[PDB]
């Protein structure tokens, strides 16, 4: 957690790890300071083929800072105006009435506030 | 090599920031020794490259100004 792989304190995502002893390395142990989160430095120690090695995969999600691309399987419907409906825009859910707008967004902007 | 990306009388100004393994770049332009005025900069891209940046250098083929955030 100090010299190899640090996660931030505000991490949002999943960590998965499984045992692989049927198919079975190096880790840094001397450094002048820790690492910042998601930093990679590329003093080395070799693992002994002690416990059976595990494989670890970490999944990190960006929360709608850009137009959305990675969504689950859901079916889209037509949009209804001037009527009180439940709406769901890119996982953003709510209840209200939708109206055509005169606001002038810029191409990096996705929603108002 | 770990990351690669290829894409298709005036002042060009940029802001470079690095946090959480991400490198953010902002860019603005204005047509006019640094003039006094107000100008606002729009984001272009952030790169998910996880290295420490403590130095940098411009690449030339006549003046450029550097300030710190």
């Amino acid at each position: 957690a100090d010299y190899n792989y640090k996660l931030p304190d505000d991490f949002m995502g999943c960590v998965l790890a499984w045992n692989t002893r049927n198919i079975d390395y190096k880790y840094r142990y001397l450094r002048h300071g820790k690492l910042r989160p998601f930093e990679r430095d590329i003093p080395l120690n070799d693992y002994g083929f002690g416990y059976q090695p595990y494989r670890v995969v970490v999944l990190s999600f960006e929360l709608l800072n850009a137009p959305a691309t990675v969504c689950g399987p859901k079916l889209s419907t037509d949009l209804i105006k001037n009527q009180c409906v439940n709406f769901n825009f890119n996982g953003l859910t709510g209840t209200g009435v939708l109206t055509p707008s005169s606001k002038r967004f810029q191409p990096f902007q996705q929603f108002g506030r | 090599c770990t990351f690669e990306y290829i894409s298709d009388k005036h002042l060009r100004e940029f802001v470079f920031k690095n946090k959480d393994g991400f490198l953010y770049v902002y860019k603005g332009y204005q047509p006019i020794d640094l003039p006094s005025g107000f100008n606002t900069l729009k984001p272009i891209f952030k790169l998910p490259l996880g290295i420490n940046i403590t130095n940098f250098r411009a690449i030339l083929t006549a003046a450029y100004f550097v300030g710190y955030l």
């Binding site: 800072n65 850009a66 606001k103 967004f105 810029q106 990096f108 902007q109 996705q110 929603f111 108002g112 506030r113 | 100004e13 802001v15 920031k17 902002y26 603005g28 020794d33 640094l34 006094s36 005025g37 107000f38 100008n39 606002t40 900069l41 729009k42 984001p43 100004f65 300030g67 710190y68 955030l69």
Partner: peptide, 30 residues
């Protein structure tokens, strides 16, 4: 030589539309 940055280096803080307000933000600015 050294010069001054007279009200330079302002960028849009996030990807959110805002209109006719005053917004306070805390970030890395010049």
């Amino acid at each position: 030589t050294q010069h001054t940055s007279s009200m330079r280096g302002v960028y849009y803080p996030d990807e959110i539309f805002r209109s006719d307000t005053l917004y306070l933000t805390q970030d890395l600015f010049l």
